[PDB]
Amino acid sequence: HWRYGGDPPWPRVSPACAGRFQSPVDIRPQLAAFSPALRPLELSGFQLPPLPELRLRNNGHSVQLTLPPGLEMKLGPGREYRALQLHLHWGAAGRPGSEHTVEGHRFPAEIHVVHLSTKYARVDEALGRPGGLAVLAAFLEEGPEENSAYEQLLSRLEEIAEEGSETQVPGLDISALLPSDFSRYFQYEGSLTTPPCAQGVIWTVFNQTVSLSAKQLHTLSDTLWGPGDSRLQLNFRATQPLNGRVIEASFPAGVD
Ligand SMILES: [Zn+2]
């Protein structure tokens, strides 16, 4: 069972993790290719009613929320997706833990919403195929006040503190966990960021962050336990070389 960090490498057990087009990456906005074909993201069905409830589980590597059928996400013509699940990556006290970085800057945490192309019917069919999976990624930053949407999930972490434990949470507005600016993002082709590291994943990284209180960020990083009896912390993969890939930007960066 793979773990975050070390020692031992990931490719010893999962060779595809040594592929050339892996995620996450460092984003350098002044060097991204401006692409006016990248239009605002379109989501539908993300505002869920309270019932039915959704599964929330500590899998030892993250906390993962299973999404119900019917959430649709469109990256552009020919690029339509159904949402499957979301999960988080974080650091520890006084240490950030986002997966993507911007000019080498690491943010406190990161949310990933994983989607399946409408071209397939099962995740296993889509693994490794160009565009088969798409992930929406947003950075979580510290703001002054409590984020009410995130509190619906963060208040439930204590009951799933032990690795492998699960609970049920009321339906909520999944789009309220994401930034409000759907027009400004970066996009590139990469991989799953855990084994088996399958390539072909379309990554979309919002430029705008979401704000959580200091207490909420502490709740996220300090509540859960992983394998053995190590704290579930620093659960992010190191950034990977672009190897000639171009990151596109849906907007002009771009001055400083
Ligand atoms: Zn992830």
CSV table of C-alpha atoms in Angstrom, one decimal, residues 2-248:
chain,number,residue,atom,x,y,z
A,2,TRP,CA,1.6,3.2,-1.3
A,3,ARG,CA,2.2,6.2,1.0
A,4,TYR,CA,3.0,9.9,0.7
A,5,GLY,CA,6.7,10.6,1.0
A,6,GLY,CA,9.9,8.6,0.9
A,7,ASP,CA,11.4,6.2,0.3
A,8,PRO,CA,10.4,4.3,-1.3
A,9,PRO,CA,9.8,5.7,-4.8
A,10,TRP,CA,6.4,5.2,-6.4
A,11,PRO,CA,7.6,3.7,-9.7
A,12,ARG,CA,9.1,0.7,-8.0
A,13,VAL,CA,5.6,-0.7,-7.4
A,14,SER,CA,3.7,1.4,-10.0
A,15,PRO,CA,5.8,1.9,-13.1
A,16,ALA,CA,3.4,4.3,-14.8
A,17,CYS,CA,4.2,6.8,-12.1
A,18,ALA,CA,7.5,7.4,-14.0
A,19,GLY,CA,5.7,8.5,-17.1
A,20,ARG,CA,6.6,11.7,-19.0
A,21,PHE,CA,3.3,13.6,-18.5
A,22,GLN,CA,2.6,13.4,-14.8
A,23,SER,CA,0.8,15.7,-12.3
A,24,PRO,CA,0.9,17.9,-10.3
A,25,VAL,CA,3.0,20.7,-11.9
A,26,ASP,CA,4.3,24.1,-11.1
A,27,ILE,CA,2.3,26.8,-13.0
A,28,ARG,CA,4.2,29.8,-14.2
A,29,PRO,CA,1.4,32.2,-15.4
A,30,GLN,CA,3.7,34.5,-17.5
A,31,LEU,CA,4.7,31.5,-19.6
A,32,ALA,CA,1.3,29.9,-20.0
A,33,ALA,CA,-0.1,30.1,-23.5
A,34,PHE,CA,-3.1,32.4,-23.7
A,35,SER,CA,-5.9,30.5,-25.3
A,36,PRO,CA,-9.1,32.5,-26.0
A,37,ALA,CA,-10.9,29.2,-27.0
A,38,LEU,CA,-11.0,28.4,-23.2
A,39,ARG,CA,-14.4,29.7,-22.2
A,40,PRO,CA,-16.0,29.9,-18.8
A,41,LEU,CA,-16.6,26.5,-17.2
A,42,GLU,CA,-20.2,25.3,-17.1
A,43,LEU,CA,-21.6,23.2,-14.3
A,44,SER,CA,-25.1,21.8,-13.8
A,45,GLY,CA,-26.7,19.8,-11.1
A,46,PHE,CA,-24.1,20.7,-8.4
A,47,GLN,CA,-26.7,22.3,-6.1
A,48,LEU,CA,-27.8,19.1,-4.3
A,49,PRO,CA,-30.9,18.8,-2.1
A,50,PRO,CA,-30.4,17.6,1.5
A,51,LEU,CA,-31.5,14.0,0.7
A,52,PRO,CA,-30.2,11.6,-0.3
A,53,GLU,CA,-27.0,11.9,1.8
A,54,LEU,CA,-23.5,11.4,0.4
A,55,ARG,CA,-20.8,9.0,1.5
A,56,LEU,CA,-17.8,10.7,3.2
A,57,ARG,CA,-14.8,8.4,3.9
A,58,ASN,CA,-11.3,8.5,5.3
A,59,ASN,CA,-9.4,6.2,2.9
A,60,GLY,CA,-6.0,6.7,4.7
A,61,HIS,CA,-4.8,9.0,1.9
A,62,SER,CA,-7.5,11.8,1.9
A,63,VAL,CA,-11.1,12.4,2.8
A,64,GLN,CA,-13.3,11.6,-0.1
A,65,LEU,CA,-16.9,12.6,-0.8
A,66,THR,CA,-18.8,10.4,-3.2
A,67,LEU,CA,-21.0,12.5,-5.6
A,68,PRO,CA,-24.4,11.3,-6.8
A,69,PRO,CA,-25.3,10.8,-10.5
A,70,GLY,CA,-26.3,13.9,-12.4
A,71,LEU,CA,-23.5,16.4,-11.9
A,72,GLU,CA,-22.4,17.7,-15.3
A,73,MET,CA,-19.4,19.7,-16.2
A,74,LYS,CA,-18.4,21.1,-19.6
A,75,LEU,CA,-14.9,22.2,-20.5
A,76,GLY,CA,-15.8,23.1,-24.1
A,77,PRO,CA,-17.2,21.6,-27.3
A,78,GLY,CA,-16.7,17.9,-27.3
A,79,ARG,CA,-15.5,17.9,-23.6
A,80,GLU,CA,-18.4,17.0,-21.3
A,81,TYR,CA,-18.0,15.2,-18.0
A,82,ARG,CA,-19.9,13.6,-15.1
A,83,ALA,CA,-18.7,14.3,-11.6
A,84,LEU,CA,-17.7,11.2,-9.5
A,85,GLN,CA,-16.0,12.3,-6.3
A,86,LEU,CA,-14.1,15.0,-4.6
A,87,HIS,CA,-11.2,14.9,-2.1
A,88,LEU,CA,-8.6,17.2,-0.6
A,89,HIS,CA,-4.8,17.6,-0.2
A,90,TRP,CA,-3.3,19.5,2.7
A,91,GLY,CA,-0.2,20.0,4.8
A,92,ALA,CA,0.3,20.5,8.6
A,93,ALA,CA,0.7,23.1,11.3
A,94,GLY,CA,2.6,25.9,9.6
A,95,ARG,CA,3.3,24.0,6.4
A,96,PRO,CA,1.3,24.2,3.2
A,97,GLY,CA,0.1,21.2,1.3
A,98,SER,CA,-1.4,22.0,-2.1
A,99,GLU,CA,-0.3,19.8,-5.0
A,100,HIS,CA,-0.1,22.4,-7.7
A,101,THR,CA,2.2,25.4,-7.1
A,102,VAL,CA,2.2,28.8,-8.8
A,103,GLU,CA,5.7,30.2,-9.4
A,104,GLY,CA,6.9,27.8,-6.7
A,105,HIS,CA,4.3,29.0,-4.2
A,106,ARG,CA,2.5,26.3,-2.3
A,107,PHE,CA,-1.0,27.1,-1.0
A,108,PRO,CA,-2.4,25.7,2.3
A,109,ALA,CA,-4.6,23.0,0.7
A,110,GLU,CA,-6.2,22.0,-2.6
A,111,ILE,CA,-9.6,20.4,-3.6
A,112,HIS,CA,-9.9,18.0,-6.5
A,113,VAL,CA,-13.3,17.3,-8.2
A,114,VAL,CA,-12.8,14.2,-10.3
A,115,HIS,CA,-15.0,13.6,-13.4
A,116,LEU,CA,-15.6,10.9,-16.1
A,117,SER,CA,-15.9,11.8,-19.8
A,118,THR,CA,-19.5,11.2,-21.1
A,119,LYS,CA,-17.8,9.1,-23.8
A,120,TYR,CA,-17.3,6.3,-21.3
A,121,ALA,CA,-19.6,4.5,-18.8
A,122,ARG,CA,-17.1,3.3,-16.3
A,123,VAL,CA,-13.9,4.8,-14.8
A,124,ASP,CA,-11.9,1.7,-15.7
A,125,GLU,CA,-12.7,2.3,-19.4
A,126,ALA,CA,-11.4,5.9,-19.2
A,127,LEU,CA,-8.1,5.4,-17.3
A,128,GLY,CA,-5.1,6.3,-19.5
A,129,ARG,CA,-7.2,7.5,-22.4
A,130,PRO,CA,-6.6,11.2,-23.5
A,131,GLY,CA,-9.4,13.2,-22.0
A,132,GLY,CA,-11.1,10.2,-20.3
A,133,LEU,CA,-10.9,11.8,-16.9
A,134,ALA,CA,-11.0,15.5,-16.0
A,135,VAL,CA,-10.2,17.1,-12.6
A,136,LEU,CA,-11.2,20.6,-11.4
A,137,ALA,CA,-8.6,21.8,-8.9
A,138,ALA,CA,-8.8,24.9,-6.6
A,139,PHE,CA,-6.5,26.2,-4.0
A,140,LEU,CA,-7.7,26.7,-0.4
A,141,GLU,CA,-6.3,29.8,1.4
A,142,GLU,CA,-6.7,31.3,4.8
A,143,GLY,CA,-9.3,34.0,5.1
A,144,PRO,CA,-10.7,35.9,8.1
A,145,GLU,CA,-14.0,34.1,8.6
A,146,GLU,CA,-15.6,30.7,8.5
A,147,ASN,CA,-16.5,29.2,5.1
A,148,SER,CA,-20.0,27.9,5.7
A,149,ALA,CA,-20.0,25.4,2.7
A,150,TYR,CA,-16.8,23.8,3.9
A,151,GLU,CA,-18.0,23.6,7.5
A,152,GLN,CA,-20.7,21.1,6.4
A,153,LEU,CA,-17.8,18.7,5.6
A,154,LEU,CA,-15.1,19.8,8.1
A,155,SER,CA,-17.5,19.3,11.1
A,156,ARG,CA,-17.8,15.6,10.1
A,157,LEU,CA,-14.1,14.8,10.0
A,158,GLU,CA,-13.9,13.9,13.7
A,159,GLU,CA,-16.3,11.0,13.3
A,160,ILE,CA,-14.1,9.6,10.5
A,161,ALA,CA,-10.8,10.2,12.2
A,162,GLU,CA,-9.7,6.5,12.0
A,163,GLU,CA,-8.4,5.2,8.7
A,164,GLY,CA,-11.0,3.3,6.8
A,165,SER,CA,-14.0,4.8,8.6
A,166,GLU,CA,-17.0,6.4,6.9
A,167,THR,CA,-20.1,8.5,7.5
A,168,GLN,CA,-23.0,10.1,5.7
A,169,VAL,CA,-23.5,13.8,5.1
A,170,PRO,CA,-26.5,15.8,3.9
A,171,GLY,CA,-26.5,17.0,0.3
A,172,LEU,CA,-25.0,20.4,-0.2
A,173,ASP,CA,-24.1,22.9,-2.9
A,174,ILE,CA,-20.9,21.3,-4.3
A,175,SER,CA,-20.3,24.4,-6.4
A,176,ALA,CA,-20.0,26.4,-3.2
A,177,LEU,CA,-16.8,24.5,-2.5
A,178,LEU,CA,-15.3,26.0,-5.6
A,179,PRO,CA,-14.2,29.5,-6.6
A,180,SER,CA,-16.8,31.9,-7.9
A,181,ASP,CA,-14.7,32.9,-10.9
A,182,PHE,CA,-15.3,30.3,-13.6
A,183,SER,CA,-13.6,32.3,-16.4
A,184,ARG,CA,-9.9,32.4,-15.2
A,185,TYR,CA,-8.1,29.1,-15.1
A,186,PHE,CA,-5.1,27.1,-16.3
A,187,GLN,CA,-5.4,23.8,-18.2
A,188,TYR,CA,-3.0,21.1,-19.2
A,189,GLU,CA,-2.9,17.3,-19.8
A,190,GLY,CA,-1.4,15.2,-17.0
A,191,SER,CA,-2.0,12.2,-14.7
A,192,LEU,CA,-3.7,11.0,-11.6
A,193,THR,CA,-1.6,12.2,-8.7
A,194,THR,CA,-1.7,8.8,-6.9
A,195,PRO,CA,-0.8,5.4,-8.1
A,196,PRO,CA,-1.4,4.0,-10.7
A,197,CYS,CA,-0.7,7.6,-12.1
A,198,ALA,CA,-2.6,7.0,-15.2
A,199,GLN,CA,-2.0,9.7,-17.9
A,200,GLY,CA,-4.5,11.4,-20.2
A,201,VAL,CA,-6.2,13.4,-17.4
A,202,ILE,CA,-7.3,17.0,-18.3
A,203,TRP,CA,-6.4,19.2,-15.4
A,204,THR,CA,-8.2,22.6,-14.9
A,205,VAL,CA,-6.7,24.8,-12.1
A,206,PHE,CA,-8.8,27.8,-11.1
A,207,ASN,CA,-6.8,31.0,-10.7
A,208,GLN,CA,-9.0,32.3,-7.9
A,209,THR,CA,-8.7,30.5,-4.6
A,210,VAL,CA,-11.3,29.6,-1.9
A,211,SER,CA,-10.9,31.0,1.6
A,212,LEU,CA,-11.3,29.0,4.8
A,213,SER,CA,-10.7,30.2,8.4
A,214,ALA,CA,-7.5,29.4,10.2
A,215,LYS,CA,-9.5,27.1,12.5
A,216,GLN,CA,-11.0,25.3,9.4
A,217,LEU,CA,-7.6,24.7,7.9
A,218,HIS,CA,-6.4,23.3,11.2
A,219,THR,CA,-9.5,21.0,11.4
A,220,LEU,CA,-8.7,19.7,7.9
A,221,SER,CA,-5.0,19.0,8.6
A,222,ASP,CA,-5.1,17.8,12.2
A,223,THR,CA,-8.2,15.5,12.5
A,224,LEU,CA,-7.6,12.4,10.3
A,225,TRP,CA,-5.3,9.4,10.8
A,226,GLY,CA,-3.7,7.4,8.1
A,227,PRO,CA,-2.0,3.9,7.9
A,228,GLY,CA,-0.4,2.5,10.9
A,229,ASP,CA,-1.1,5.3,13.4
A,230,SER,CA,0.5,8.2,11.5
A,231,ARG,CA,-1.4,11.4,11.2
A,232,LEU,CA,-3.0,12.0,7.8
A,233,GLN,CA,-0.9,15.1,6.9
A,234,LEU,CA,1.3,16.3,4.0
A,235,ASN,CA,-0.8,14.2,1.6
A,236,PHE,CA,0.5,15.7,-1.6
A,237,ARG,CA,2.7,14.5,-4.4
A,238,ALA,CA,5.7,16.6,-5.4
A,239,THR,CA,5.5,18.6,-8.6
A,240,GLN,CA,6.5,16.8,-11.8
A,241,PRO,CA,8.5,18.1,-14.8
A,242,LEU,CA,6.5,19.5,-17.7
A,243,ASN,CA,8.7,17.7,-20.3
A,244,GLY,CA,7.7,20.1,-23.1
A,245,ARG,CA,4.0,20.3,-22.2
A,246,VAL,CA,2.4,23.8,-22.6
A,247,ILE,CA,0.0,25.0,-19.9
A,248,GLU,CA,-2.8,27.0,-21.3
